[PDB]
Amino acid sequence: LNDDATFWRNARHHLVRYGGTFEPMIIERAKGSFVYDADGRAILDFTSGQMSAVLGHCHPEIVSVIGEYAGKLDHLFSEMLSRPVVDLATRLANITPPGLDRALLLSTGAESNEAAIRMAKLVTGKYEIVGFAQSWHGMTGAAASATYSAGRKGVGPAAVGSFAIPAPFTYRPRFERNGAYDYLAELDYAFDLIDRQSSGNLAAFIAEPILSSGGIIELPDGYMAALKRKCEARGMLLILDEAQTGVGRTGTMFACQRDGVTPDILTLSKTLGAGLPLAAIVTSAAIEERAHELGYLFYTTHVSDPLPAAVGLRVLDVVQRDGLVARANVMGDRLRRGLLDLMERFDCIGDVRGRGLLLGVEIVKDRRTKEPADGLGAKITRECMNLGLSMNIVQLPGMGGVFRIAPPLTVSEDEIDLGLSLLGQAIERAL
Amino acid sequence: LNDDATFWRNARHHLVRYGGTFEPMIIERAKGSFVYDADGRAILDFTSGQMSAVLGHCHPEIVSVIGEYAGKLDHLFSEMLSRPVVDLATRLANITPPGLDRALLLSTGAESNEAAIRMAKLVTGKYEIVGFAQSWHGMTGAAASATYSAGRKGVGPAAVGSFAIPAPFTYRPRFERNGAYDYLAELDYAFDLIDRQSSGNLAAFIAEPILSSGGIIELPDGYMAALKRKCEARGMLLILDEAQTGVGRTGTMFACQRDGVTPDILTLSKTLGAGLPLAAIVTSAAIEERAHELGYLFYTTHVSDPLPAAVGLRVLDVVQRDGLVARANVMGDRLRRGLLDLMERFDCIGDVRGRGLLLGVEIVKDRRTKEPADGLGAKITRECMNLGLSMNIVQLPGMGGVFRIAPPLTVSEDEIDLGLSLLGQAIERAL
Amino acid sequence: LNDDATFWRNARHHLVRYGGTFEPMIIERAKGSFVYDADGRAILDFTSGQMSAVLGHCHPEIVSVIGEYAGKLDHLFSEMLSRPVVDLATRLANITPPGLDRALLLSTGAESNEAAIRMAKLVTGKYEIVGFAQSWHGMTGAAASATYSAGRKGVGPAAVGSFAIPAPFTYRPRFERNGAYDYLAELDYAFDLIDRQSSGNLAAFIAEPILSSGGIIELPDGYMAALKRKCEARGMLLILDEAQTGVGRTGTMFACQRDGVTPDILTLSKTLGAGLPLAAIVTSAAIEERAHELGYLFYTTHVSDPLPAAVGLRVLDVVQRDGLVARANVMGDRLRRGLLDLMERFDCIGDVRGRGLLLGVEIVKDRRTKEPADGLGAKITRECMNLGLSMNIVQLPGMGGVFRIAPPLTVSEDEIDLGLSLLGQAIERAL
Amino acid sequence: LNDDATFWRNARHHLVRYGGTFEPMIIERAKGSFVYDADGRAILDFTSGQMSAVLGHCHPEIVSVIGEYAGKLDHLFSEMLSRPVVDLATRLANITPPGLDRALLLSTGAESNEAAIRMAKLVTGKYEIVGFAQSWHGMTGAAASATYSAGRKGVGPAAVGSFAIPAPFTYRPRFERNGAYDYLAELDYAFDLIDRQSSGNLAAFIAEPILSSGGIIELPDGYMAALKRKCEARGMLLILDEAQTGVGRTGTMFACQRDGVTPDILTLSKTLGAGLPLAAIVTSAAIEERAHELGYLFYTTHVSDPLPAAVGLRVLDVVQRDGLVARANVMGDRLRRGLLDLMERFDCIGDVRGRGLLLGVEIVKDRRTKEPADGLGAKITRECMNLGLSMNIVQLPGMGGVFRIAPPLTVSEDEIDLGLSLLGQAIERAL
Ligand SMILES: Cc1ncc(COP(=O)(O)O)c(/C=N/[C@H](C)P(=O)(O)O)c1O
Ligand SMILES: Cc1ncc(COP(=O)(O)O)c(/C=N/[C@H](C)P(=O)(O)O)c1O
Ligand SMILES: Cc1ncc(COP(=O)(O)O)c(/C=N/[C@H](C)P(=O)(O)O)c1O
Ligand SMILES: Cc1ncc(COP(=O)(O)O)c(/C=N/[C@H](C)P(=O)(O)O)c1O
Ligand SMILES: [K+]
Ligand SMILES: [K+]
Ligand SMILES: [K+]
Ligand SMILES: [K+]
Ligand code: NA
Ligand code: NA
Ligand code: NA
Ligand code: NA
Structure with a gap:
């Protein structure tokens, strides 16, 4: 039974509650x-x-690979390279769109958004970040500052320079032009406002192709492209957070492939690790080179660890192959x-x-x-x-x-x- | 050979550089x-x-356990509980000092510090965080804002309310009283300054018992205790980051046991996961209860995942047993x-x-x-x-x-x- | 002649340029x-x-009064009261709408907005301030952080928690509903966004009844009232900046009288001092009492100085009488x-x-x-x-x-x- | 009598309290x-x-001059120049030390510090400001963010990048080296800390030559010079706030003349206006030129007004002459x-x-x-x-x-x- 007294007793005495409610089963x-x-x-x-x-x-394949590296090559000094890492980075450079060339292999989706955000701030020399009013990018610092669907109250100021704009929502439209939902005009109208609040330090816009936690809100026809243009026009990067939409979930390897819009940095995690804690960001050679020239730092315990990298490579393999x-x-x-x-x-x-x-x-x-x-x-x-x-x-x-x-x-x-x-x-x- | 042309070729074309230099081997x-x-x-x-x-x-044991859960119980909806999770939380409540009762099971050390920091801000209703001038707590938002040994430049403002004080360093002392290094007076002197800069919103002090990245600087005799008193005096929590010092590394299960000083929240990761990405925070029942009353949120993909929890439990087992x-x-x-x-x-x-x-x-x-x-x-x-x-x-x-x-x-x-x-x-x- | 070589020479060698261009005359x-x-x-x-x-x-009257106090009672320790000060404060309590009872006599319009803003933050225990995207409240810290028509670039971050919404502009409307400019819906739509970006710390909305520097944009029928309701609904004060519109300029003693909407704090300056540097804020007895209980501080050199107070009283007199x-x-x-x-x-x-x-x-x-x-x-x-x-x-x-x-x-x-x-x-x- | 019932009645009903206690007299x-x-x-x-x-x-002279301009040339469009303004700016360029060439004529001491601070941020392209832990620079935004003797609590975050260091206080020294108060080492020790907290955006250090509100604390022998060197070393301006010490109060025209240390920007007010609301900042031609190239803006109602300028010129005259x-x-x-x-x-x-x-x-x-x-x-x-x-x-x-x-x-x-x-x-x- 699910009623194990002791289980629930210990559960009640020793778990921190971190949102929602625990399901009544074991x-x-x-x-x-x-x-x-x-x-x-x-x-x-x-x-x-x-x-x-x-x-x-x-999944048996994952089970095999896991087993295999747990026993052969598991975790390493973050300065030591190995095959699973280079193979994965390479695979990702290869299956993402052109223009996305270099990868950084991390552990969580929030961590991957923090890495992308730090990189953008570094290469633009700027710090203001703009997201959707119904976004969810994670619970940590910058990812949280850009998360507007929840988590903003009771915890002090968000990061300096955080702004949001309304996401294009065709089921409940609020911006009308000539009797119709003009989501492209809504976008323009939002940016002008942003422009007016900015200290002249716009570094990036971060976006989910489909806002999940925010209510499965899919960016409509042409929106992404127009968004990318807003950024280019302002010298801002566009970071696409594909934690959930990436790796095939929406019926393209990556959702941005669907709109045929290539972001400056792409972040991955949930579906990449398929259950294990592996995440990543992928950016252009040029952006990476400039970050490096500027001393880009994002050195963690598990960045470049073989076992997780090995796991995500197997995930891609299976996805591809099947x-x-x-x-x-x-x-x-x-x-x-x-x-x-x-x-x-x-x-x-x-x-x-x-x-x-x-x-x-x-x-x-x-x-x-x-x-x-x-x-x-x-x-x-x-x-x-x-x-x-x-x-x-x-x-x-x-x-x-x-x-x-x-x-x-x-x-x-x-x-x-x-x-x-x-x-x-x-x-x-x-x- | 380590000279695999292709390996290094792909390595050069497809890896983002994130600090230091890659070791020349495979x-x-x-x-x-x-x-x-x-x-x-x-x-x-x-x-x-x-x-x-x-x-x-x-490690064979880890290899077994890993294998075992990879194939039986791997990853779950964050609202679903399971044994490895409750057992681990329980174990930790049990091997940490009295007063540390409830755990939250995450993935990285930075993530664990972000969770502790958010919790402290929430329960104090305040936002200023104080760390050591040679600290390292991670690359993400709040963990980074409190990291002073590196990473502060070129990336815009840190979090609002970030302050540091000098760490007590007996090998290179800079605060003298009566011809001797009065590190306790240095502490007082630092706090008064802090007090003067504060907006009256001190939420926590975060500290490594031994600053690793900062140069293996061990807090000296009585320092921790005095620090804890500074916090209590200001209604601030004390968060001890034991990412590296925890789990036995310094010859006590937890370093804070050595000084006999119990922090409000304790964070764990590196050594807890022993190579795998598992992290955690542990706090008192009272603090947890208040966080919960205040809507504490820190909901992630892998919080409470069975496989990692299963792994860390085996780590503790082995450590204990051997x-x-x-x-x-x-x-x-x-x-x-x-x-x-x-x-x-x-x-x-x-x-x-x-x-x-x-x-x-x-x-x-x-x-x-x-x-x-x-x-x-x-x-x-x-x-x-x-x-x-x-x-x-x-x-x-x-x-x-x-x-x-x-x-x-x-x-x-x-x-x-x-x-x-x-x-x-x-x-x-x-x- | 206006061509005094020396004049312009000294002008060129010794004046800091602070905006616009100097008119070519003397x-x-x-x-x-x-x-x-x-x-x-x-x-x-x-x-x-x-x-x-x-x-x-x-103006001869001003000339007389000026003369009179310059020679009899000029400047005092900020703890010393005198008649011109109490009379003026009283007059203002009297000619402003009901509910505005207590005055603070300062020197500039920006200073008066800083005083109102500090008061609002203090009594709400909060810090986020919202203004119009085409506002101008002054060149100093908080007044500047809330000024969106200009001055935002090149000078670092604005104050934490600064937001703006578009002002209602009937000549160039951008928010349509059913083929018409629905400025009330635009307002709602703006606030929801604000609500979503807020850390839950909305303290005030600050507004000019007619945005001057922003292009003489007059808030339309019912707008002010709706705005006041947005604030009340959020526990925010409404501060009305009447630096230019006050004291009769728009054909009512105070513009807010026209809409019959009483703000929580009203600020005055330009027209109050009629050329001399005198400014003021007026608030309710209740707000003032609470500010005081909370230690409200805004102690300056010229707050409560007799000569300027004497001058503004004469201004009101003349305005009234003539x-x-x-x-x-x-x-x-x-x-x-x-x-x-x-x-x-x-x-x-x-x-x-x-x-x-x-x-x-x-x-x-x-x-x-x-x-x-x-x-x-x-x-x-x-x-x-x-x-x-x-x-x-x-x-x-x-x-x-x-x-x-x-x-x-x-x-x-x-x-x-x-x-x-x-x-x-x-x-x-x-x- | 001082007991005028009505006076105190109106006083109680209509004055906002802004610090301290009102003296019981009229x-x-x-x-x-x-x-x-x-x-x-x-x-x-x-x-x-x-x-x-x-x-x-x-003062009869002031009384005359006041009278004279009140009736002849009082207040003007901020783009219109006149003699009193150019004469004063010129006088100040002339009586301040070499290297201080251009003036900006404002109204209050806080306003003058805001103008200096904005200028420094603009020309350095940076935003962090450092002051003394017992400073007082005013009640407005940036001046307040740099004021540490008071006013910091209950009003939300200060400006991003605010830091303080302890002032050198010979009567109550807390930094000892070899049995003596080594205030120069204290300075070094403070800066290193600052250096460690900085985001690499140090723009200025602001300082009173003698901290008045802070307890008449006089910077000791050689301190100022060393301070100036700290700034130069970091590419930071040094702004000297001489609101109280300027214009002869300390027995030199300007206190900085005493140490023979010339700041990048010098601010004046209290004693300059001798009771009237006139303030100013003076900086080098080079700094001014660069500010201007960068669009320096600080346009107010009373900047460059003839009457106040006329008054301060008479003040300097008298001071000089007598x-x-x-x-x-x-x-x-x-x-x-x-x-x-x-x-x-x-x-x-x-x-x-x-x-x-x-x-x-x-x-x-x-x-x-x-x-x-x-x-x-x-x-x-x-x-x-x-x-x-x-x-x-x-x-x-x-x-x-x-x-x-x-x-x-x-x-x-x-x-x-x-x-x-x-x-x-x-x-x-x-x-
Ligand atoms: C005390 C402490 N806390 C938290 C972290 C953050 O860990 P993570 O980046 O995995 O989230 C680290 C990282 N450390 C470096 C990576 P080093 O091992 O070189 O000292 C740490 O040393
Ligand atoms: C789009 C996106 N990016 C980043 C993250 C952060 O992932 P993590 O917290 O593991 O670091 C999430 C988390 N999602 C929730 C946990 P949900 O699955 O309920 O939508 C996400 O949905
Ligand atoms: C050194 C200094 N700079 C700037 C200011 C700001 O002046 P203001 O508030 O008029 O703008 C003051 C005010 N001082 C108090 C009012 P005190 O005289 O009590 O020391 C000051 O002492
Ligand atoms: C509505 C309003 N409030 C406050 C201020 C700040 O006044 P001050 O700078 O004197 O402190 C101004 C200044 N205005 C310009 C100077 P303009 O007259 O050109 O619109 C204002 O227009
Ligand atoms: K690693
Ligand atoms: K989970
Ligand atoms: K006064
Ligand atoms: K003027
Ligand atoms: Na690619
Ligand atoms: Na315990
Ligand atoms: Na009234
Ligand atoms: Na000079």
């Missing part, structure tokens, strides 16, 4: 698209763990259609959006009003878990609660169907 | 106290990789004596300091002047590597270069001797 | 609505000096009509706006496009001076250049006509 | 070294009003000797320091301990006023309360004696 095993509680009940993992496991849990980017589009499409079928069935489903296997479903009280359905979302989530489907809902003011659905890229056609079915049931039950 | 394997290059030459690892591997490389804390004192002592013998032999060795297996050797041009020996240190380091002994030297203005010697707690009596011998040779050669 | 005298150069040519002062002299130059507030409406109206007649004559006159004797005329290349007329404005200004009419034009990006026309409240019907006539001539000449 | 007139209450009692003004009136109250700088030394010396006689009489007088007519007397409980005499100082001050001698005491932690004695440079031999006599009586009464 996870004892995980395999493929499932985790299993202490009774052995299999729970369908519709969020790939914490939005990371693109290959599912305990055409998991394409599986994302097919299963993605399979899942979207189901969701839309549900939506056909239940009025509370106000919107189905996202791309590939990063989909969101927005719960509303009224389609005409798009009135958020207060607690209905939480209910559905509770029912899902009872039904054996692990889900996650995010909620910001002005928005219905949004389910973030992101199964492993290794997910089966059956698993999807199972998932869709458990979900309609949870919805039927929640009403 | 590391292909590692085992116990050694790593091996591409020719198969065994290099004696006198810094435990990046000051982490207390159990040495590829009495590696005591091995640190014995080997530590064996090594100190050797160093002192060298010092007897070579005038350039100006000081031998540190504790347990975290020792430093300061190179000088003149013992009377304590004039730094310009390049001599770098030379010795170069000779060591030729001689097959991997070493590391740190250098700050006003100080001779310092070797940071920190072999695995699993190091043999022979390995030490080997090390001492290779070192005297390198010194003989460098002169 | 002012030797001033009287009523004119100043006179070294040839004795009378220049019609259409900006009341630096937008201050509501009573015109060298019904100069009403003269502002009549002459104001006389002047607006003329301007509009011009506008009837010249296509370049794109807009005539403002209120009372604070009017603006926007120069454009095209009424349909509202294309700014590049240099045309500067030309007209140059011609005016030749014609003996001192004028001033302000120019921000996205806007035609704007003449700021603000003659003394003591201005004659003839002086206005003269002014209108000189202006059409300058325009005819400039084309 | 000042109705002032003349020479005295002010007179409502009963007509003459109070001997031992602080020259708020440390400003070097010529005493209502050899008031020398009167300061003679009367200063007369007063110091008296003070020392008192000190001979009363043990509570722990120290008599300062220079010229800017003297301080530190009250202690014990000369051996230098134990502050708690409330004794306040008592003496209360007795002085009863005795008809207006005085002022300042008190910081770690220090006895200090009387700041600074009579008009126009003070008579008799007035001094009167003052000394009233003071010994107050002391006799207070015990």
